[PDB]
Design a binder for this molecule. Structure first.
Ligand SMILES: Nc1ncnc2c1ncn2[C@@H]1O[C@H](COP(=O)(O)OP(=O)(O)OP(=O)(O)O)[C@@H](O)[C@H]1O
Ligand SMILES: Nc1ncnc2c1ncn2[C@@H]1O[C@H](COP(=O)(O)OP(=O)(O)OP(=O)(O)O)[C@@H](O)[C@H]1O
Ligand SMILES: Nc1ncnc2c1ncn2[C@@H]1O[C@H](COP(=O)(O)OP(=O)(O)OP(=O)(O)O)[C@@H](O)[C@H]1O
Ligand SMILES: [Mg+2]
Lengths: 14, 83, 257, 257, 257, 137
């Protein structure tokens, strides 16, 4: 199952 | 208090008319065998009159003697937890 | 698609004629003719605002070709820490007069002019306790100088504020109180919601004892909760594909409250 | 330097799909589609803010050529003793407008305009109890007037603050509670950190009974302690050259709590 | 000296055909045939003056036989606290006419005469908020009396000025917003800057994950910073005899901001 | 990288919102230093009590550790003309009852004794002069 880097989520954001 | 709250033995009470009297002092009249409901009286023209019944928010279906509420409060203060 | 029309309808809003609304309108019409100031009090989900809007939409602004509109009833709602110039700003905008820069005495003199020119008979002030204490001087002024029935609307907090000043309490003593639904009146109102507002294609028979043990416990008799709980249970039931509400799904919705 | 790369990685942060995050997103979609205001509550290390950032970082802003952004979900966090202007200032900045000097009503009017312009469906307010008591008038207003689901996030003190205003209490009544891990759920979660978060070169077998006693007494079931204990033990044990966590080195980290 | 050629190049300016520029020109072309006044808004480093200037370099003056020059687009930037005379002086001078010792009501009439004579279709007023509040009566008079589209260009303060007057707000109600770069659009733009603007003999490959982290932090999406930073890194690097920009020299630049 | 706040309990209760905010927003460790009263204040808010749990504790000197430390005061801080031999059992009994294991009393008692000693003309501390200083407590 997928787990996310909190900084990748920031980089992918609007 | 603001929003019609009363505080008594650590329990917070609200009731059907209290918010209109915020800042006034009321005589709580209570039964030590079950403090989950309190009668609230106020003074008008130097005559004490009945105001409303106040109920400890979120435990209206329970019962608590004043001794249970006091002993549990000491355990919470000793434990260091919020009340 | 059939479902998506019902899901749009259920998320909308309507005014149902109820006894408490009918009882307010027949009291406000008396105060409008007699020019008496008064207050509507009650708890925070009894539907006071819908009853006052339903009244504003009865007496519509009458129009004559070249004149300011004849507006019998004004309804306004103040912002928090409302000052005298904020109250006057809103009464002037409501009557469709644009508000220019000026001092408080300019705003006062202009508000007093437009209230006369539009022929106002009643001024309904919602959430009256957002008013700063000094503004009540201007509210009593409007009501003694002009023939205007000022209605203050609010929760019991309002009276706690009002009792701080004799001068106001005495203008605004006459009151109508909104209460909670019970007994036959709660039971009958649930059937009005089922037929008139939910319009589900299989009857949910919500007046049955097992459904009313859920609704009476969860709504505590408030019309605000009854509209919210039932629309949510209807959205959730139709989006799951059932043609009516059922005991477990209404339990799932009521568990959150 | 392979060690220094792991020390730079492990002091970082991640989001894991857990049941208490998947549950929140299914619930918040329900509130967003139905436009119903509500609150999320629970003890301070349950990870409510990560669960809400995982919501904000899904549902990304949509861009249309030269239009203002369409922003389905807004998450803001207020400063201490937040006044009406500070709430409006932050909502305006989050939708990417610069806020120019004005009176409180200029900030109010501009905020209502950008919320309605950016098509906002939901407003999430973290640490809601930093709000000054009067500002809730403006939060109730945003939710009454615009079709916006306001979500308040806080802990058990927030309820002690909400219960001081009947108007807020009867609106923000629907709620979800974040709880602590136990039994099989704490056991299963420890394996997810070992295999998805820590990335140590050999299995540390953290779910074994001799190790779960150590971790249970340390963490009390809080996800915010579990991530903290297991990052600190990984950082420390790699700086001593082991490929694992073991009984004595974990008891060294847990003896700091 | 080959090196002295390159530093003289990087110090200058150039226009890159960004989607946002294309989006403005396509929108203003609708407004130019329709003859509708409008405004362009956005943050100060987003490209607005350059995007407007590129539209002025399209639609350059015609000169058929025996006629005045036809000048479809006029563009001006007022100075600060620009009065009614100074606006007319700029419109007259942009159209190459000399002007001699007028009172303001001569400057007004000579401006209306050259705006008719040159066949002006559009008037782009950059930094519109430098206008004194009274000059908008002359801008509305130009826009109503002539068949001219006025485009006010500016920051979020421009809105604050316009909202102070109903007369203006309504002539200029329509709008387009300039916004910052993000996601794949920032990455594509950095790749375009490298090959289009920098042109160093060896590739720096700045779309590489490690380098976009430095630029995203350093620039925060403004097209302004992105350009300055990439130029300053090419200049500094070239002065030290390097063939490329690299990781260390780019961090040396970005730290100054 | 690190912010250290001494006497943390002088902070007004609301300021902790700003202390937590920084610690969470910026990669900055915040260290709160204080007495047992600090924890009595901290336990008055869950939100704070959980960001700052880890705790190192400073104790009192005892046994061999107090005895060994007395030699360091003699050979590195005092450096008197000839040696007072403060590790001897009778001088340790006087010092133990005086200081109660606190390093902030050991530093104080021995300066007060050494100043008296030198200003009266002694090349060292002795039983009676140290008892004169310790009797002030
Ligand atoms: N007669 C009614 N018909 C339909 N919906 C109603 C009626 N009365 C109340 N409601 C519904 O109840 C909810 C709350 O009603 P309302 O806003 O009037 O409460 P309120 O008394 O105004 O609250 P407050 O006192 O804080 O202003 C709304 O969803 C409203 O549509
Ligand atoms: N779902 C998750 N996946 C990964 N790490 C998590 C998750 N939830 C929490 N954490 C970790 O545990 C910590 C929990 O802190 P978090 O801010 O999420 O809790 P919180 O409830 O917001 O605290 P408070 O209520 O006091 O603000 C985070 O810093 C993160 O490192
Ligand atoms: N499309 C573009 N192509 C190349 N350079 C650009 C572009 N847009 C902006 N720049 C550069 O960015 C800097 C500022 O750009 P620009 O002058 O357009 O900002 P602006 O939005 O006009 O500023 P303001 O809004 O304050 O008037 C200048 O160095 C300019 O050359
Ligand atoms: Mg949080």
């Amino acid at each position: 199952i997928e787990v996310w880097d909190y900084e990748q989520l920031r980089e992918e954001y609007g | 208090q603001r929003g019609g709250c009363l505080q008594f033995q650590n329990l917070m009470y609200r009731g059907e008319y209290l918010a209109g009297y915020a800042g006034e002092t009321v005589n709580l009249r209570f039964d030590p065998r079950d403090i989950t409901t309190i009668l609230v009286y106020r003074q008008e023209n130097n005559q004490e009159v009945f105001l409303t019944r106040a109920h400890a928010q979120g435990l209206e279906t329970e019962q608590l003697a004043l001794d249970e509420a006091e002993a549990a409060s000491r355990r919470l203060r000793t434990a260091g937890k919020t009340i | 698609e059939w479902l998506q029309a019902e899901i749009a309808r259920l998320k909308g809003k309507s005014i149902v004629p109820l006894q408490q609304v009918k009882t307010l309108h027949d009291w406000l019409d008396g105060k409008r003719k007699a020019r008496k100031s008064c207050r509507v009090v009650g708890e925070s989900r009894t539907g006071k605002t819908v009853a006052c809007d339903a009244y504003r939409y009865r007496h519509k602004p009458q129009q004559e070709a070249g004149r300011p509109p004849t507006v019998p009833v004004v309804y306004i709602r103040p912002h928090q820490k409302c000052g005298p110039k904020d109250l006057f700003k809103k009464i002037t905008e409501y009557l469709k007069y644009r508000v220019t820069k000026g001092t408080v005495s300019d705003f006062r003199d202009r508000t007093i002019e437009v209230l006369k020119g539009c022929g106002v008979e009643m001024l309904i002030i919602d959430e009256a306790d957002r008013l700063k204490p000094e503004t009540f001087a201007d509210v009593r002024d409007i009501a003694e100088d002009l023939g205007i029935a000022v209605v203050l609307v609010g929760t019991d907090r309002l009276d706690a504020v009002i009792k701080r000043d004799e001068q106001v309490l005495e203008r605004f003593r006459a009151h109508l109180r909104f209460g909670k639904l019970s007994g036959e009146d709660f039971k009958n109102t649930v059937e009005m919601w089922e037929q008139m507002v939910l319009k589900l294609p299989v009857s949910s028979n919500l007046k049955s004892k097992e459904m009313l043990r859920i609704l009476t416990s969860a709504t505590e008799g408030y019309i605000g909760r009854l509209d919210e709980i039932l629309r949510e249970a209807a959205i959730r039931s139709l989006s799951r594909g059932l043609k009516k509400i059922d005991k477990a799904v209404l339990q799932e919705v009521a568990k959150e409250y």
